[PDB]
Structure formats: C-alpha cells, structure tokens
Design an enzyme around this catalytic site. Structure first.
Site, short mmCIF file in Angstrom:
data_model
loop_
_atom_site.label_atom_id
_atom_site.label_comp_id
_atom_site.label_asym_id
_atom_site.label_seq_id
_atom_site.Cartn_x
_atom_site.Cartn_y
_atom_site.Cartn_z
N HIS A 34 39.33 -13.87 -21.62
CA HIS A 34 39.86 -15.14 -20.84
C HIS A 34 40.93 -15.70 -21.39
O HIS A 34 41.21 -15.94 -22.72
CB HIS A 34 38.56 -16.33 -21.13
CG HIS A 34 37.37 -15.95 -20.47
ND1 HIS A 34 36.16 -16.55 -20.78
CD2 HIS A 34 37.20 -15.35 -19.31
CE1 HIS A 34 35.18 -16.13 -19.81
NE2 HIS A 34 35.95 -15.37 -19.04
N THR A 54 31.78 -22.92 -22.10
CA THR A 54 31.34 -23.46 -23.22
C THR A 54 31.52 -24.97 -23.19
O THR A 54 32.22 -25.44 -22.49
CB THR A 54 32.04 -23.11 -24.49
OG1 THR A 54 33.44 -23.21 -24.06
CG2 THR A 54 31.92 -21.38 -24.81
N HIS A 63 34.35 -12.69 -24.89
CA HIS A 63 32.83 -12.71 -25.01
C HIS A 63 32.24 -11.32 -25.02
O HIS A 63 33.08 -10.47 -24.21
CB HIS A 63 32.39 -13.50 -23.79
CG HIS A 63 32.85 -14.87 -23.67
ND1 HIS A 63 32.39 -15.83 -24.03
CD2 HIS A 63 34.10 -15.24 -23.13
CE1 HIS A 63 33.00 -17.12 -23.99
NE2 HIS A 63 34.24 -16.51 -23.22
N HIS A 103 40.78 -15.76 -25.54
CA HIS A 103 39.50 -15.40 -26.35
C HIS A 103 38.45 -14.30 -25.68
O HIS A 103 38.71 -14.14 -24.39
CB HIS A 103 38.58 -16.58 -26.86
CG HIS A 103 38.23 -17.28 -25.63
ND1 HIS A 103 38.89 -18.30 -25.05
CD2 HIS A 103 37.06 -17.27 -25.01
CE1 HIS A 103 38.18 -18.55 -24.13
NE2 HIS A 103 37.08 -17.92 -23.83
N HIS A 155 32.41 -19.59 -32.66
CA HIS A 155 31.80 -19.13 -31.22
C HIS A 155 32.58 -17.97 -30.69
O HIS A 155 31.67 -17.13 -29.90
CB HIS A 155 31.45 -19.97 -30.43
CG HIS A 155 32.50 -20.96 -29.94
ND1 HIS A 155 33.33 -20.87 -28.85
CD2 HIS A 155 33.09 -22.20 -30.39
CE1 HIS A 155 34.06 -21.83 -28.56
NE2 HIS A 155 34.00 -22.60 -29.59
ZN LIG Z 1 35.54 -17.89 -22.18
#
Ligand SMILES: [Zn+2]
Length: 258
Positions: free
Chosen positions: A117, A197, A94, A92, A62
């Site tokens: 993040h 998530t 996005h 991570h 993801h």
């Molecule tokens: Zn995140």
C-alpha cells in the site's frame, strides 16, 4: 486491549473501540471482476516518483513503514479517478504466514501472498492529519505480490529488516526509489473505501492495480521474521497482518480497462 491481529484483539474485535469498523465504506473488499463496471471516463494514472525522498523505515508493531519527505510535491499521484494532487507519505505491506494468504483485497476471492500500500494525501488539506478527516483525503495504490521470481527493487528493503526486527525500532532509509515496485501496466480498479487499520476512517479512494508484481519465496520469508513485540518481550512473529474483506454495501467498483 490494544488492537492487533491476534485471537483476542484481531479484526473481529475492532468494532468495540472503533464503531466505524461496521461502516458503509470499509476496506478491503473482494473485487468481483465480472461485476466491476468499465468506466471510459476514467483517466490513466499519473505516478511521478522521480523526485521521491525516502527517509526512514520503522517497525510500528503492526507492519513496517518506509516514510518519505512529504513537505513538498516530490512524489505525487494524480489522474485516474482523482481530482488534485496527492503526495506520497509512506508505503507498507500486509503478508501471510503462508503463500496462500496475506493480501487484504482479493480478486474473485483469490488471495495473494502480500499486498503493498502506497499511501498518499490530498494536498488541498495541508497535512496528513487533516486529510484523514475528509472523504477524498487519501489515495492508496494497492499492488498485489505473488511468489515467483525475485523483485530486484525490493531487495534493499528486505536487507534492512534485521535492523528493525521489533516494535519501535527504526533505521535511516534514504535514496530508495519506489519506481522499482511498480508493475509494467497501470490498469486498475477503483472504489471509495477506508483505512484498513484503526482508526478505520472512511477517507480513502482505493486504486488497486490489476497486475501483480512477483517476489521470491526468500524475499517473503524475510518479512515473516519480523516481530509484533518490542525488544525483550516474548517473541510473536509478524505474520497475517491483514484485515479480511468487508461488505461492499452500496458501492460500485469501476475498472479502467475492459
Ligand atoms: Zn495497508
């Protein structure tokens, strides 16, 4: 089937397996700058990452995560709206299929190319797994990315992506210093929210930095070359792995600045 960002298992479907998706303190949200309340009592953030120990980079299907050694107080966050010490466990990103989208939070409805993040957990809870079950268990620093000049400190990350192209691949990733990803200013907005998530637990104090960092077009291009799929499976590029803004409901966004 299992959750993702596609048409058939995307954010609008999550509530079927994770009913908290329609909860009262879900994230991300749109930050309305004219309605955010300046709070004079908020303290400056304290980021101590000089002793950070990165260990590995992983494609989890993801996003890609850089993981840190959180067995001791090496990289911590404190201050701001927080009580206590929060240890960095992983970061991570996005990102979008285009430069005009990719961020989770938005500012006055503006979307950024990507969002970083930095995830931290409250040491009073002893481990990450217990922290996600508490209302003040996690502190996530959100940093927006805009396309402009290259960010030198991000290049080490970009260059290893080839080696974790598909889901389940990992690589040794030591001696990475996360100070290279911070903007010059630590002015922020804060609100109580959740993981963005599944499982979507409402255990996060979000700290979103006002100042974006710039990355080059080439850097963001490399993110879009990752795959959602596992090796030997039909290729699905890892793009648009962001959840859209959620209703603010009974919450106030506080600003550390005027
Ligand atoms: Zn995140």
């Amino acid at each position: 089937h299992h959750w993702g960002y596609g048409k058939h298992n995307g954010p609008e479907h999550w509530h079927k397996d994770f009913p908290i998706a329609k909860g009262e303190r879900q994230s991300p949200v749109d930050i309305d700058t004219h309605t955010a309340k300046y709070d004079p009592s908020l303290k400056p953030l304290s980021v101590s990452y000089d002793q950070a120990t990165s260990l590995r980079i992983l494609n989890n299907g993801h996003a890609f995560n850089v993981e840190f050694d959180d067995s001791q107080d090496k990289a911590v966050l404190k201050g701001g709206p927080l009580d206590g010490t929060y240890r960095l466990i992983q970061f991570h990103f996005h990102w979008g299929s285009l430069d005009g989208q990719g961020s989770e939070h938005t500012v006055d409805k503006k979307k950024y190319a990507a969002e970083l993040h930095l995830v931290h957990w409250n040491t009073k809870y002893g481990d990450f797994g217990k922290a996600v079950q508490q209302p003040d268990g996690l502190a996530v620093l959100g940093i927006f990315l805009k396309v402009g000049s290259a960010k030198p400190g991000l290049q080490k990350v970009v260059d290893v992506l080839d080696s974790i192209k598909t889901k389940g691949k990992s690589a040794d990733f030591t001696n990475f210093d996360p100070r290279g990803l911070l903007p010059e200013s630590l002015d922020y907005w804060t609100y109580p929210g959740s993981l963005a998530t599944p499982p979507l637990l409402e255990c996060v104090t979000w700290i979103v930095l006002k100042e974006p960092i710039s990355v080059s077009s080439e850097q963001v291009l490399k993110f879009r070359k990752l795959n959602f799929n596992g090796e030997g499976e039909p290729e699905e590029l890892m793009v648009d792995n962001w959840r859209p803004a959620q209703p603010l409901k009974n919450r106030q966004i506080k600003a550390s600045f005027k």
